[PDB]
Amino acid sequence: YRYTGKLRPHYPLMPTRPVPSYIQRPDYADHPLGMSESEQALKGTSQIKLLSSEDIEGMRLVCRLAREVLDVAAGMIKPGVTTEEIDHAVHLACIARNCYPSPLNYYNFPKSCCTSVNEVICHGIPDRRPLQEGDIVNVDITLYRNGYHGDLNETFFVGEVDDGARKLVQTTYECLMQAIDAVKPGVRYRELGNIIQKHAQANGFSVVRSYCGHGIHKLFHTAPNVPHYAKNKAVGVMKSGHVFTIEPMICEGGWQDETWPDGWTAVTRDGKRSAQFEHTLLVTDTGCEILTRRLDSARPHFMS
Ligand SMILES: CCC[C@H](C)[C@H](N)P(=O)(O)O
Ligand SMILES: [Co+2]
Ligand SMILES: [Co+2]
Ligand SMILES: [K+]
C-alpha cells in the first residue's frame, strides 16, 4: 500500500473494549461480521420513515446524549493525546449514559468513535498516534439508546493551526449550516448538495462524492441518501417527521478518495486535508430541529 500523505496507522490496537450487558445493543453488535439485519432488509429502498411522537422523543434523547459525549472528546483535544485515549473516554462516556457506542462492531469497525486526522476524510480508526500541534482532527460520535441512534461530528484544531486549516474548517462548517438552513418540508434532498458545493467551490475547495448523509433512527444508516455535491440524483422530498444527517466532507485539493487496507479509513487520494461536520436533523414545520446541537453554547468547538 502506497500511503497518500504523511499519516500512517499506529498499531497495535488495544483489544476490543467490552460494553456491559446491561446496555441495550443494536442488532449488529453480536453479528460476527457486524452486519445489521434490520438495515439489510431495507437495502435499496428509497422510502422514508415518518416518525411517531414516541420516535421523536427517543431521537431527541439519544441525540442530546451524543452531543454530551462529543463535548467530552472536544475537551480532550491537545497535542500528545492519542486517538485511542479519546476513544476510551468516549466509550466510558457512552456507558455512563446507558448507551451503546454505535460504531463498535458496526461492520466490524473496531472502536467506539471515528478519529479522522488531516488527510483522513472520515472513518479513521483510533490508534496509538499522538495528536500533533497543527493537526485538524474530526471526532464522529454515534450513540444507541432504547432502539434509536444519534450521530454527530465536529472538526477540532490541535493547538495552533495554519490559515489554510482555519479556512478549510470554517468553510466546511458554513457548508453544513447553509444546508441546514434550507431544510423544511417540500425541499428535495438533492438540493442540499447544490448549496454545499456552491459554497465549497467559492472558497477553492472540493466536495467528497463517495460518502453521503443518511436517514437515521432505529437504523444507523437508512433512507434517505443525502449527497453533498451538486447535480446529484438523490430520491425524495423533505416532510415534517423525517430524520436524517447532513455531514459534508470538503477538501483542500481534489475530491477523490481511497480507503486504507484496514477497510475503513478514507483518505484524499492527493494527501491534502479534509474536514467534516455532522448534525442529525428532524424536519418540522417551520424548518428543522437540530437534534445534536449544543444547548449551552453558541458555537462549535473550533471557534471557542
Ligand atoms: C463506523 C460507524 C461510523 C459512521 C459510518 C459515522 N458516524 P457516519 O455515518 O459516516 O457519520
Ligand atoms: Co457520524
Ligand atoms: Co452519519
Ligand atoms: K480530516
UniProtKB/Swiss-Prot annotation:
Binding residue positions for a protein: H123, H221
Reaction(s) the record says it catalyses: Release of N-terminal amino acids, preferentially methionine, from peptides and arylamides
Record localization: Cytoplasm
GO cellular component: cytoplasm; cytosol; cytosolic ribosome
Binding site for Zn(2+) 3: D140, D151, E278
Cofactor binding, note field: Binds 2 divalent metal cations per subunit. Has a high-affinity and a low affinity metal-binding site. The true nature of the physiological cofactor is under debate. The enzyme is active with zinc, cobalt, manganese or divalent iron ions. Has high activity with zinc; zinc cofactor is transferred into the active site region by the ZNG1 zinc chaperone.
GO biological-process terms attached to the record: platelet aggregation; protein maturation; proteolysis; regulation of translation
EC numbers on record: 3.4.11.18
UniProt keyword list: Acetylation, Aminopeptidase, Cytoplasm, Hydrolase, Metal-binding, Protease, Zinc, Zinc-finger
Cofactor or coenzyme needed: Zn(2+); Co(2+); Mn(2+); Fe(2+)
Binding site for Zn(2+) 4: D151, H214, E247, E278
GO molecular function: aminopeptidase activity; initiator methionyl aminopeptidase activity; metalloaminopeptidase activity; metalloexopeptidase activity; zinc ion binding
Record note on quaternary structure: Associates with the 60S ribosomal subunit of the 80S translational complex.
Sequence similarity: Belongs to the peptidase M24A family. Methionine aminopeptidase type 1 subfamily.
Name of the protein in question: Methionine aminopeptidase 1
Lineage per the UniProt record: Eukaryota, Metazoa, Chordata, Craniata, Vertebrata
Name of the gene: METAP1
Residues of the full protein shown: 81 to 384 of 386
